[PDB]
């Protein structure tokens, strides 16, 4: 709600059929992870840990790369979106 007000300002070409943020193992995010640093350090609120699993709202991804690096267990299959997709920064 709060940061998706500011993500509305950015320009995107969303690739909804190709999620570039896949989580390799959902069970590592349930019992192996304690603090979930992918949620607390994502500048775009992409990751939200529900009890249904991890909700990865990849459409707002700013392609920074923090989630892949801050994740201690490596279970974020992180790619850039394809060419002409993802954030399209105007006056970046």
């Amino acid at each position: 709600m709060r940061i998706e007000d500011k993500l509305y300002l950015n320009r995107y070409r969303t690739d909804e059929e190709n999620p570039h943020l896949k989580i390799k193992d959902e069970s590592i995010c349930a019992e192996k992870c304690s603090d979930r640093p992918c949620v607390s350090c994502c500048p775009a609120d992409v990751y939200e840990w529900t009890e249904s699993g991890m909700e990865v709202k990849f459409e707002g991804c700013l392609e920074c790369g923090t989630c892949r690096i801050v994740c201690p267990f490596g279970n974020i299959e992180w790619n850039y979106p394809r060419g002409n997709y993802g954030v399209l920064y105007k006056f970046g």
Partner: protein
Amino acid sequence: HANVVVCIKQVPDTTNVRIDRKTNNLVREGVPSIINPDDERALELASQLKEKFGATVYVITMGPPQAKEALKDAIAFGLDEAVHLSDRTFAGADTLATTYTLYWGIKKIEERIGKIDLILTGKQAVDGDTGQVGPGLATRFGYALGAYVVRIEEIDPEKKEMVIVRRLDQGFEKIRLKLPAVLTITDELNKPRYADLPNLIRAIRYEPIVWTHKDLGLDPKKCGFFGSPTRVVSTNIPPARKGGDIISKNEDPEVAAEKLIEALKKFEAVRLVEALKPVLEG
């Protein structure tokens, strides 16, 4: 082989062109201009018509000098040629003025390849979503207008006649169009391809054929603000909708259901539903 001409329009990216309430204007500065998304389906159909029947597809745009980058993004689909109608004689044009320029733009294309067997436009541009250029272009040429195309069945290149599925409000309808026709493509026809590199690299080092108002031979004041009958006198953003009120609550388990139909009938628009007349008329 057929001759296809795809009239595309460079449109600002209206997914990002948003309303700023505090300046009360469209914040469309910095937002790059793209193909009209109704025309990416027209270009993808034209590239399908090029790999199935070998139709020489041209793409034409009457726009600003910055609209040569939209004409290069159309060559990435695999198209043969792009044509730019770039002149500020054409600036501020309306639909009658655009169609008069586009009729004489395609008429010069007809002096190069032959009589145009098919004209593909989009259903609407998004800036000024009128959608009358496609209908207007079928009248200048005297071509069969198949508008709001959702499917393409038999595109018989031997009988010079194809079957489309036009969407109307009572339902879709199959139509045996007679070529030469002017189609008008919606979003639901196809999904545009991810372009390959040999066409995208060719799209980068491509220069669209620029034609001014002297190149076409048209009347010098039948195309701009003078050939425009209508005049846009004022553009103004809409209001901030209208604050509502929690008709029901989290207490009423269902008693909120008739309180919805209580407060539906206070609105004018429920006459328009075509299925809530037995609760409004009675």
